Amino acid sequence: GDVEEAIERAVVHVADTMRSGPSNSASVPALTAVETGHTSQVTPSDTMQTRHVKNYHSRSESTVENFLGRSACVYMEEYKTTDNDVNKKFVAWPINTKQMVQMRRKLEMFTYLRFDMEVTFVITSRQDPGTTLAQDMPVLTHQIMYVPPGGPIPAKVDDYAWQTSTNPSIFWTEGNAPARMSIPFISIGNAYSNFYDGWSNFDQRGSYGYNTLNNLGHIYVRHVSGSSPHPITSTIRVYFKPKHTRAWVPRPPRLCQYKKAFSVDFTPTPITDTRKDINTVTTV
Amino acid sequence: GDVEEAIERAVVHVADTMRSGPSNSASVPALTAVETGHTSQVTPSDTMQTRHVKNYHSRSESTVENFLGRSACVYMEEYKTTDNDVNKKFVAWPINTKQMVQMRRKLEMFTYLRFDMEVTFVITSRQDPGTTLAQDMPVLTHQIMYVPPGGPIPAKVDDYAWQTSTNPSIFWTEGNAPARMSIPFISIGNAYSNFYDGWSNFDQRGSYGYNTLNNLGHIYVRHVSGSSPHPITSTIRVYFKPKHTRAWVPRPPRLCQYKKAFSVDFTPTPITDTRKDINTVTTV
Amino acid sequence: GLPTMNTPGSTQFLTSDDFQSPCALPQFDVTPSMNIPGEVKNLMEIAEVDSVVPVNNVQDTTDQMEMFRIPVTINAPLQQQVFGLRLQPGLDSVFKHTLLGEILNYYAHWSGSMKLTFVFCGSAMATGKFLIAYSPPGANPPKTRKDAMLGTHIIWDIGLQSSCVLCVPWISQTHYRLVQQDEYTSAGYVTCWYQTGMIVPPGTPNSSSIMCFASACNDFSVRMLRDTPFISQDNKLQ
Amino acid sequence: GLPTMNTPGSTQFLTSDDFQSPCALPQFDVTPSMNIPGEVKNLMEIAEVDSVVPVNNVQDTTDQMEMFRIPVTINAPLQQQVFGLRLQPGLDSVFKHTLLGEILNYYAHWSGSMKLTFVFCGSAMATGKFLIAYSPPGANPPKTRKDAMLGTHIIWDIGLQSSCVLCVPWISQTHYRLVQQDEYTSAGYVTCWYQTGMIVPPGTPNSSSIMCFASACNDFSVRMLRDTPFISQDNKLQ
Amino acid sequence: GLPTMNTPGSTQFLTSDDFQSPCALPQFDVTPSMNIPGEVKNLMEIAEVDSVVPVNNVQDTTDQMEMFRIPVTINAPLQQQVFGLRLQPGLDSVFKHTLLGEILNYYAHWSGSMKLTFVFCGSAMATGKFLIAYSPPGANPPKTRKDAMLGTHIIWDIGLQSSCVLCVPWISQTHYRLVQQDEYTSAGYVTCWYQTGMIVPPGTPNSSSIMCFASACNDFSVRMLRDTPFISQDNKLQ
Amino acid sequence: GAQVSTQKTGAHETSIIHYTNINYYKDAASNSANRQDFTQDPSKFTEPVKDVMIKSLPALN
Amino acid sequence: GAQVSTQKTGAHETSIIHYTNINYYKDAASNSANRQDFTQDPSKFTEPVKDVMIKSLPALN
Amino acid sequence: GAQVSTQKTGAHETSIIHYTNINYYKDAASNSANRQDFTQDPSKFTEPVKDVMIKSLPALN
Amino acid sequence: SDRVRSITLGNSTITTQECANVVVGYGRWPTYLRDDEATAEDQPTQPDVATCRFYTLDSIKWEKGSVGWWWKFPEALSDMGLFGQNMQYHYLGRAGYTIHVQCNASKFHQGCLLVVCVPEAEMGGAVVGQAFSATAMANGDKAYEFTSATQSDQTKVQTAIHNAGMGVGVGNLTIYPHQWINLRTNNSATIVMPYINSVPMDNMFRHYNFTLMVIPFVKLDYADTASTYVPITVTVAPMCAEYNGLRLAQAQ
Numbered sequence A, B: 001g002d003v004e005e006a007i008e009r010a011v012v013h014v015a016d017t018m019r020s021g022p023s024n025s026a027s028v029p030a031l032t033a034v035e036t037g038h039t040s041q042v043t044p045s046d047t048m049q050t051r052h053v054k055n056y057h058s059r060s061e062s063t064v065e066n067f068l069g070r071s072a073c074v075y076m077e078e079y080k081t082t083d084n085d086v087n088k089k090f091v092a093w094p095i096n097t098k099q100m101v102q103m104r105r106k107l108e109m110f111t112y113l114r115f116d117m118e119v120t121f122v123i124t125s126r127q128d129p130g131t132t133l134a135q136d137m138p139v140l141t142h143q144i145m146y147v148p149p150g151g152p153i154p155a156k157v158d159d160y161a162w163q164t165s166t167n168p169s170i171f172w173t174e175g176n177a178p179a180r181m182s183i184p185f186i187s188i189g190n191a192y193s194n195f196y197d198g199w200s201n202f203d204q205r206g207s208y209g210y211n212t213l214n215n216l217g218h219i220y221v222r223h224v225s226g227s228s229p230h231p232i233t234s235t236i237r238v239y240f241k242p243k244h245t246r247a248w249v250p251r252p253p254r255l256c257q258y259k260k261a262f263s264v265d266f267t268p269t270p271i272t273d274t275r276k277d278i279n280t281v282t283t284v
Numbered sequence C, D, E: 001g002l003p004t005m006n007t008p009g010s011t012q013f014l015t016s017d018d019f020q021s022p023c024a025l026p027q028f029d030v031t032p033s034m035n036i037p038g039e040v041k042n043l044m045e046i047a048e049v050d051s052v053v054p055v056n057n058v059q060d061t062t063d064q065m066e067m068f069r070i071p072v073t074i075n076a077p078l079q080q081q082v083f084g085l086r087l088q089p090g091l092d093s094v095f096k097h098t099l100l101g102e103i104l105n106y107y108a109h110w111s112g113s114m115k116l117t118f119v120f121c122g123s124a125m126a127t128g129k130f131l132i133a134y135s136p137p138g139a140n141p142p143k144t145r146k147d148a149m150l151g152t153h154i155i156w157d158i159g160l161q162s163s164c165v166l167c168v169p170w171i172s173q174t175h176y177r178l179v180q181q182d183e184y185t186s187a188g189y190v191t192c193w194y195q196t197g198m199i200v201p202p203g204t205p206n207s208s209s210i211m212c213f214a215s216a217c218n219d220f221s222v223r224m225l226r227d228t229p230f231i232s233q234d235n236k237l238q
Numbered sequence F, G, H: 001g002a003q004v005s006t007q008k009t010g011a012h013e014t015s016i017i018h019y020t021n022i023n024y025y026k027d028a029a030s031n032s033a034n035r036q037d038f039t040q041d042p043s044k045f046t047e048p049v050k051d052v053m054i055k056s057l058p059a060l061n
Numbered sequence I: 001s002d003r004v005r006s007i008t009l010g011n012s013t014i015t016t017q018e019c020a021n022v023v024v025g026y027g028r029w030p031t032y033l034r035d036d037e038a039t040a041e042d043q044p045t046q047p048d049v050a051t052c053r054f055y056t057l058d059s060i061k062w063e064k065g066s067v068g069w070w071w072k073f074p075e076a077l078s079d080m081g082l083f084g085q086n087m088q089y090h091y092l093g094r095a096g097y098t099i100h101v102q103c104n105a106s107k108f109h110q111g112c113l114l115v116v117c118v119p120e121a122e123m124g125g126a127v128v129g130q131a132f133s134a135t136a137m138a139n140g141d142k143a144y145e146f147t148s149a150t151q152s153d154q155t156k157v158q159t160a161i162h163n164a165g166m167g168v169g170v171g172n173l174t175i176y177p178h179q180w181i182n183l184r185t186n187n188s189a190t191i192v193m194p195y196i197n198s199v200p201m202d203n204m205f206r207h208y209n210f211t212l213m214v215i216p217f218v219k220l221d222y223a224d225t226a227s228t229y230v231p232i233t234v235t236v237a238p239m240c241a242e243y244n245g246l247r248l249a250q251a252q
């Protein structure tokens, strides 16, 4: 009514070590058949004498919610306040999570993912170097607009599309706390796919790979009415923080360095690094 | 008293699909008389064998409150901090929703509308280019005043009317969160009219059309005491977000592009685009 | 003062935000409500209403109204095709400007079944049977009535009941398809063929028109609000 | 207004913060959940799964797959060493790229026991006994089977059961060790020796391979989330 | 939003503030606590412990350890003075670097009684009686045993019990005195005199040492946290 | 007098999902939107016929 | 309707360690993270064998 | 669940002197300081002798 | 013993005298789509015995120098009786499978294979940036092979075995449902894969749900025996196959 008792007063720990003494039996825990595709459930008490240890360690920091739940930079680009080239004055980004290596490797440890998304923007501006820099420009305001697939796309900073009568936009002024908002799980499927071993056409032709399922739309950003006498360059950095996460069918982590944003493509890389012989255990 | 239970724990979904098997009867659902002005209530189970499908989809995002409830730019204009022309230093806008195409098309999908209005202003300033730009101007403050029909209208930035002893005004300083306020349903009628097939005079003469019912007043905006040595240009953008909405008698969406702010006027536009023949179904 | 700490998002203006704000006209006495007929509560109520589909939107169109008339004639070759259209209610020119298509164009996702009602507009003396089918996506569209009859279809017989309803079911791998449809989100084709032929007695016109209406079923819904590609401007009006 | 006072931290963006924020898509109807097999809830579930350890990651490697094959041969000198490795699951090249090592590399601290499973892959006709031991840290690693047998060990006999599990216990002065292991946080060595020898009957190959799997036990956990040294870039991809 | 109004102090960083702030390592599992001996809860627990007072901190000191040895000798003139010190536990060189003085130097106010324990370190065969006194402030310090005996004192007799405790009471006009003591906050003097004399039998050394310990009593406390004058730097270390 | 109601479902399966609101202004115009009213009737438009028509039975005569 | 639950343990021995939360938004997507769910099962991965295998008994035959 | 406790005495004679606190974070590390625990024991340091010694009686023999 | 195993689906039965256990998906047994998880509204066909039965693909030879093979599903079964026919006539399909990999040698042979099923085994091209065609990864029941050397042919997939065509460490493929055939103890491997995807049903031609990989981690070796190669045979049975969206058959 007023207060509610969702208290988790009983939290999970790591397994205790049971005291274990000598044995002489036909029962043999240490011998198994790896061939079954089974990982052994052996513990020290099975193969040696152990003392009792009340273990209070907890796996709290390794839940998928926690592992994925930190904001990571997924994109960055610059847009000028004034320039002769129309395209240098605004950013148009096709939303995806494959261009920044760190976030990509983490998400890619799972095949399917389902989560809500917290998006934070970090926008900074700097005056371009030049011969004459004296000016007195008022504070800048930026507009970030999300255009769902199929909506009208802006062709220049001053076009009608920026009216956002229906698309969601954020107007933010410099000097303030970074802009932020939440987006729910928006896939047309039941989970987001990090990989897709298939084609776009029924023919088994067309696009191949996860890129065929990426149609989340674009993010467009411009200065509001910020034309300055001497150019100023703003850089926008977008951060993603998944929350209320669920993950399915885990995969080996990416070993080879990434080469392309929209394909699994790689260059063969060795299993691991080498040492002189199979018995080398020293450093020098 | 303290807490209140307005919880909507029972929300509406889209219709389930009922399992349906073979049939051989005199009862024939698929044949009707479109002539009655009736749209058929047929579902797949009426014309084919269906499996049962528990459908959880919901029409939440398509309620009129939701469709109309996003802020949209309805106007924008510039006013200078210093200029020789008196009129270049303040804005005078006759409130209406017909000048910005996106919002207009949405509202115009209904004949009558009744709602409260949330108004947000986005004001940005830029220093005008010139030979000598060095100055050190303190932060700017703007005044936005609403003048109901018949009230004294300002003729210049420094006139008595700006005293606002009774008209509502907002004083806002740059660098801060955009100004905002709510206005209740202010029509003299029971609902706002998007269209009006009639005249102003009983004679069936005078003004024709919705413009004859538009008398919501004006919005006047100026810099407070912002005269700067070198001119600065501010641009104000006004956003409307209807809330607590009700809509009546829906109409076909506007097909032809808009030509005038205060009239339905258009240029004939074809029904839709064409294809080579009535059987063409490929893309290339 | 009570100790507080501003979090990210503070001072921003999110277009789709939902906060309270001071009223500039304190205590304004609103005009009483009146019960006007035809209240709308959900845009889907509109999409559920039939509108005439410009099926015959062919290249050589001289007269605009011809787009609504599907031609049907006497002595047509056996098993002849009457028309063929691809199911992209929000993208294909045949549907994009109908009531249903216009509503779809303010959203990015859609799901549900559709009703395609066909009404025969020839004289009471003409007769005919037509096979109307729906083909779920696959690499190739049906080129023959034999191909078409393997999919979901209905055989329409003309009599007192002038109209017939082909209800195209929601058959998809995903729960929702995109309004800006692509190959992955492909929906298929709807085609019509002569089952027998349009037979006529002496003294009646040789050809007639069929009209097509379209509307959404009760399992239909849209998601992801977006601006429509159908309206624009280069300047403020006035 | 209610009197308030902003405290330090106000307006900052802490990457690991946990606040609420407005939803840009109000009332968006999420696609229904579906019960997909293989849900993961904790990364430790992955680290608890065996992966093949590249124990034979020697310098002269011609063929990459050779790294997974530990050589064992007939007529080996008595008490000969089969292999030796140092216990730094997150740092040593033998473990760093296994499932366990990869998970460890997203953290800075670790604690718990490990399972090293050895599987004999020679013919059913070969026989042999091996002594596999774990030596807690000390100034010097074991150089002889006599040295090795004083520590924690198991004597593996080959028969129907092809695999044997050496479970290396958590013996440490601190509750946790560093993933970026140092001398203070030293864990020791694991070595293998011929107990008897691999004997063979006529008509069978002269040498065979042994494989090594590694996984964490139920008392294992990691702490202090950190970025991995294993992935980088000089440019945005595309 | 809820209407609020920032008050003065908003956004400032006060070093001694006490607010909550977000945790950068959400859900970090802290290493379990262990019961280590010697827990301290209040700095006064330290000040209550005896430390050796460098009473003989005289100018000509050759050997540093001599500072802890108060000289006492045979055939001393009657009523001779052994030592004299001024009670400024946080300021005078005799006390400022003892445990008690060091703790006092992190504060600006102090109050309470003190224990000055004297221990005779000559042979078991030596004898002697000493008068140890405390003189509350006044314009002039005692110059003679006759002057000293009018104040608070104890007459110490040497025997099996080697140590004697002069407890200097808190006698002050104010509840607290300043650590950076001044005339207003004057505390007085502690002096020691021969009551009889140190007598010795044949075959024992002619002079001996007395040591002085100091600690706070249970009515002692400090106030007003401040930085100590005893530590500084011109550069960052390294 | 705070009002407590249910939220729109998120990525996770549903009790912890309710939010609380308190009105701070004297005018109802100041209140937030009615994002959660899902009452709906398509029949004024889909079937405005005087005589009701059951699907199974023929339309004319 | 405020929810009150326990905090993650700090440097000091544990009652004063509970925090309170109130949701301010109409969409569950707006809510903070589920930092405190510790349900866990490694057996889909460590032992997906049809016939269950007890450690004491031999693996084959 | 707000905690209410007494304040440290001020210039004026003491009921109006209690303050209230509510924790806003999920980790106890986030909490304010324990400025008010006055438990104290000087005997581990002032008297760590095996056999207890009463002041009135002599120290040796 | 437990080594003995018998499996019957439709008109086919499989028997093994020397097996390990039976690995089951992620502990998930195949099952028909429930009403509360469906989107496609038409009544599905569930051919039962006609499709849910054992199909034996063409055999292959394991030689001393073999490096590994892969087969993509459902493509590998596109020509198998009524299972293939149903795939052709329907827009959507759904199924789980019982995979039985057979390999017998002798008590004097040695060798060890990893038998894994990798869901969404999206692969990289031989030359980065260069697109390849479907034919580079699947074509009926044809076994594709990995290589030791890194692939140069741009019309192919990057076949270097140690990265399994996916850019990961081949020794970590064990997180996917798998079993080992160690010649010394086994003679076959059986893995039951449930339907795993991000959508309830999917088109069976356009999407390869999972890839079966058989990789020799320990090379085939033997002495003076007259037998040279050791055959490897794959037999698989669809389970709980159901299809929706009937229409004309897809030409290929």
Ligand SMILES: Cc1cc(CCCCCCCOc2ccc(C3=NCCO3)cc2)on1
Pocket (backbone or CB within 6 Å): A095, A096, A097, A098, A186, A187, A188, A189, A191, A192, A193, A194, A195, A210, A211, A212, A213, A214, A215, A216, C178, C182, C183, C184, C185
């Ligand atoms: C980021 C990222 C990762 C990917 C894979 C895409 C996974 C997305 C899962 C579903 C998201 O919602 C959809 C939106 C549109 C489409 C689409 N498919 C055909 C083209 O557009 C499908 C799903 O590529 N970029």
Ligand SMILES: Cc1cc(CCCCCCCOc2ccc(C3=NCCO3)cc2)on1
Pocket (backbone or CB within 6 Å): A095, A096, A097, A107, A117, A119, A144, A145, A146, A168, A169, A170, A181, A183, A186, A192, A193, A194, A213, A214, A215, A216, A219, D024
């Ligand atoms: C594909 C795929 C799926 C993923 C995660 C990507 C999905 C991320 C969610 C999409 C978020 O997109 C935005 C939506 C709106 C806004 C925005 N609204 C207000 C202004 O900016 C910004 C980002 O991994 N692969």
Ligand SMILES: Cc1cc(CCCCCCCOc2ccc(C3=NCCO3)cc2)on1
Pocket (backbone or CB within 6 Å): B095, B096, B097, B098, B186, B187, B188, B189, B191, B192, B193, B194, B195, B210, B211, B212, B213, B214, B215, B216
């Ligand atoms: C915006 C907009 C839309 C229109 C049509 C006007 C609809 C307004 C509905 C009623 C608003 O309140 C009124 C105020 C004044 C008048 C008026 N009528 C004669 C001139 O002034 C009537 C209604 O034109 N511009």
Ligand SMILES: Cc1cc(CCCCCCCOc2ccc(C3=NCCO3)cc2)on1
Pocket (backbone or CB within 6 Å): B095, B096, B097, B107, B117, B119, B144, B145, B146, B168, B169, B170, B181, B183, B186, B192, B193, B194, B213, B214, B215, B216, B219, C024
């Ligand atoms: C005509 C008509 C009606 C509509 C909607 C238009 C009505 C919009 C409400 C009018 C809002 O006007 C304002 C009132 C006051 C202020 C203001 N008050 C404080 C300073 O600015 C700004 C706008 O559609 N057609």
Ligand SMILES: *C(=O)CCCCCCCCCCCCC
Pocket (backbone or CB within 6 Å): B001, B002, B003, E002, E003, F001, F002, F022, F024
């Ligand atoms: C409704 O008010 C009944 C319960 C009272 C709850 C306390 C309100 C919390 C502080 C906000 C006050 C709002 C003043 C604008």
Ligand SMILES: *C(=O)CCCCCCCCCCCCC
Pocket (backbone or CB within 6 Å): A001, A002, A003, B002, B003, F002, F004, F020, F021, F022, G001, G002, G022, G024
């Ligand atoms: C839950 O609301 C039941 C108890 C009410 C507690 C009062 C809320 C304190 C002020 C915050 C109101 C939140 C409005 C966004």
Ligand SMILES: *C(=O)CCCCCCCCCCCCC
Pocket (backbone or CB within 6 Å): A002, A003, G002, G004, G020, G021, G022, H001, H002, H022, H024
């Ligand atoms: C404890 O919560 C029990 C009583 C609830 C008091 C209402 C809380 C006042 C508003 C602060 C909410 C804190 C959310 C971070």
